[PDB]
Amino acid sequence: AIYADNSYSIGNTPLVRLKHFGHNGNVVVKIEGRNPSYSVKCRIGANMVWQAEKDGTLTKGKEIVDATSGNTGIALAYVAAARGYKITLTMPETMSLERKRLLCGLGVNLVLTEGAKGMKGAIAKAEEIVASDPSRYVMLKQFENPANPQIHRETTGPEIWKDTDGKVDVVVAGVGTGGSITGISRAIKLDFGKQITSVAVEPVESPVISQTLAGEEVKPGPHKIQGIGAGFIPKNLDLSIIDRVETVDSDTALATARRLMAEEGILAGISSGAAVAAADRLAKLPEFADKLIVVILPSASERYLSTALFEG
């Protein structure tokens, strides 16, 4: 069919079997780089806007606000352009140059926040922006807005179910807001009724989900896996549906993304490398050796040319 604007064209991303990871093809990746603005967040950029329209919090003349590590911002930006809204976004200054320049090209009022404060800083700035003029702005707050996991429950999850003919046994996803792993897991476990293993991935440098579940002190840290590991437990992470948490270090994340490019011909972003490295570890345990593992690859390589991903 013909989509009325770019926001309606979200999803229907392909599954590709990996040849140099996993064990005899038990690792398959979902290429979320193939989306309107080339990341998984295109889905929530669209649905958060649609939902706010539906419940009347977003109207003509209202200006969108949120905090992002980049991809959600780019997602909200193309949707704002497509559907006719002004938009302000906060983002840590340390995020990739590509994110900054693309946001500006999409017509965003971009507010860069202090690198040291990370997402908490960007979230804080967005809140004080909106508080300065509540009638002008609407913050869509991706870290707690239920419209985030809901679109993954409605689209991403069902796509996985259909394309695997219900054979998916494991889903592996890095956690930023938690929306992807949450919505996908609810779809497959609750809507299709299959008791899969849901695997959250986080940086070993900032393993706050692992620490939380272990009853240890939460100690966030710096890392290079752009897009995940926000340093706190986000509201859109449904801890209750997470069966397993896997930690991955930055170096191995980067090396794995380079391997995906050079060995599989898959133009993956950094967090895609982290997710596949975690999946590869599970895939080579005899307990998962004959299970079908589906891995979310959130973004594409060219959004990271200015990062350590293209070191060398």
**What residue numbers does the annotated binding site for hydrogen sulfide cover?**
6, 34, 267
Picked from ligand 0JO, a second copy, none, the partner binding residue 176 (CB below 5 to 8 A depending on kind) is ligand 0JO
Per DSSP (E only), the strands in 149-227 are 168-174, 197-203
DSSP class of residue 262 equals: I
Smallest distance from a second copy to CB 216, Å: 38
User: Are 91 and 70 contacting, i.e. CB atoms less than 8 angstroms apart?
Assistant: yes
Which one-letter amino acid corresponds to residue 109? N
Binding-site positions read 6, 34, 71, 176-180, 267, 271
The dihedral region occupied by 84, where left means phi > 0, alpha psi between -120 and 50, and beta the remainder, is left
Q: Candidates 9-17, 79-87, 178-186, 281-289 — which segment interacts with ligand 0JO by CB under 6 A?
A: 178-186
Residues 217, 227: Cα–Cα separation, whole Å: 23
Torsion of CA 174, 177, 182, 183, to 10 degrees: -110
CA dihedral 111, 115, 116, 117 (to 10 degrees): 30
Site for a second copy in 11-30 (CB under 8 A): 12, 14-17, 19, 28
Name which of ligand 0JO, a second copy, none residue 114 binds, using a CB cut-off of 5 to 8 Å depending on partner kind: none
Residues of span 104-163 touching a second copy by CB under 8 A: 105-107, 163
Structure token digits, residue 144: 């707690």
Residue 33 corresponds to which tokens in the numbers above? 């780089």
Residue 54: enclosing H or E segment and its boundaries?
A: helix 42-54
Question: Hey, CA dihedral for 33, 248, 281, 264, is it positive or negative?
Answer: positive
Catalytic pick from 41, 141, 224, 235? Answer: 41
Q: Which stretch binds ligand 0JO (CB under 6 A): 70-78, 124-132, 186-194, 260-268?
A: 70-78
CB of 12 to ligand 0JO, least distance (A): 18
Binding residues for pyridoxal 5'-phosphate, by number, are 71, 176-180, 271
Partner interacting with residue 16 (select from a second copy, ligand 0JO, none; CB below 5-8 Å by kind): a second copy
* 258 is a site residue for a second copy (CB under 8 A): yes
Catalytic residues: 41, 271
Residues that bind ligand 0JO (CB under 6 A): 41, 68-72, 174-180, 227-228, 269, 271, 298-299
